Amino acid sequence: LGQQQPFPPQQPY
């Protein structure tokens, strides 16, 4: 619980 989570591929337009 800490290290930010890596956003998904291709940001949401």
PDB file of N, CA and C in Angstrom:
ATOM      1  N   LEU A   1       0.828  -1.202   0.000  1.00  0.00           N
ATOM      2  CA  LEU A   1       0.000   0.000   0.000  1.00  0.00           C
ATOM      3  C   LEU A   1       0.866   1.257   0.000  1.00  0.00           C
ATOM      4  N   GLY A   2       1.061   1.834  -1.183  1.00  0.00           N
ATOM      5  CA  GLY A   2       1.867   3.035  -1.297  1.00  0.00           C
ATOM      6  C   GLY A   2       2.196   3.378  -2.736  1.00  0.00           C
ATOM      7  N   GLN A   3       3.212   2.718  -3.283  1.00  0.00           N
ATOM      8  CA  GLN A   3       3.627   2.960  -4.658  1.00  0.00           C
ATOM      9  C   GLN A   3       2.417   3.113  -5.574  1.00  0.00           C
ATOM     10  N   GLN A   4       2.295   4.283  -6.193  1.00  0.00           N
ATOM     11  CA  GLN A   4       1.182   4.557  -7.094  1.00  0.00           C
ATOM     12  C   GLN A   4       1.047   3.457  -8.143  1.00  0.00           C
ATOM     13  N   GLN A   5      -0.169   3.277  -8.652  1.00  0.00           N
ATOM     14  CA  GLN A   5      -0.430   2.258  -9.661  1.00  0.00           C
ATOM     15  C   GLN A   5      -0.238   2.820 -11.065  1.00  0.00           C
ATOM     16  N   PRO A   6       0.407   2.030 -11.936  1.00  0.00           N
ATOM     17  CA  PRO A   6       0.669   2.429 -13.323  1.00  0.00           C
ATOM     18  C   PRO A   6      -0.603   2.481 -14.162  1.00  0.00           C
ATOM     19  N   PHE A   7      -0.975   3.681 -14.593  1.00  0.00           N
ATOM     20  CA  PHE A   7      -2.172   3.866 -15.403  1.00  0.00           C
ATOM     21  C   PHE A   7      -2.206   2.872 -16.559  1.00  0.00           C
ATOM     22  N   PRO A   8      -3.415   2.607 -17.077  1.00  0.00           N
ATOM     23  CA  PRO A   8      -3.613   1.674 -18.190  1.00  0.00           C
ATOM     24  C   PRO A   8      -3.059   2.214 -19.505  1.00  0.00           C
ATOM     25  N   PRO A   9      -2.965   1.336 -20.514  1.00  0.00           N
ATOM     26  CA  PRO A   9      -2.454   1.702 -21.838  1.00  0.00           C
ATOM     27  C   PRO A   9      -3.410   2.618 -22.594  1.00  0.00           C
ATOM     28  N   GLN A  10      -2.859   3.649 -23.226  1.00  0.00           N
ATOM     29  CA  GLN A  10      -3.663   4.598 -23.986  1.00  0.00           C
ATOM     30  C   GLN A  10      -4.682   5.290 -23.086  1.00  0.00           C
ATOM     31  N   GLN A  11      -4.347   6.496 -22.637  1.00  0.00           N
ATOM     32  CA  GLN A  11      -5.232   7.261 -21.769  1.00  0.00           C
ATOM     33  C   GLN A  11      -6.628   7.367 -22.373  1.00  0.00           C
ATOM     34  N   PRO A  12      -7.639   7.526 -21.505  1.00  0.00           N
ATOM     35  CA  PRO A  12      -9.037   7.645 -21.930  1.00  0.00           C
ATOM     36  C   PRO A  12      -9.315   8.962 -22.647  1.00  0.00           C
ATOM     37  N   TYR A  13      -9.540   8.883 -23.954  1.00  0.00           N
ATOM     38  CA  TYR A  13      -9.816  10.069 -24.755  1.00  0.00           C
ATOM     39  C   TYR A  13     -10.882  10.938 -24.093  1.00  0.00           C
TER      40      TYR A  13
END
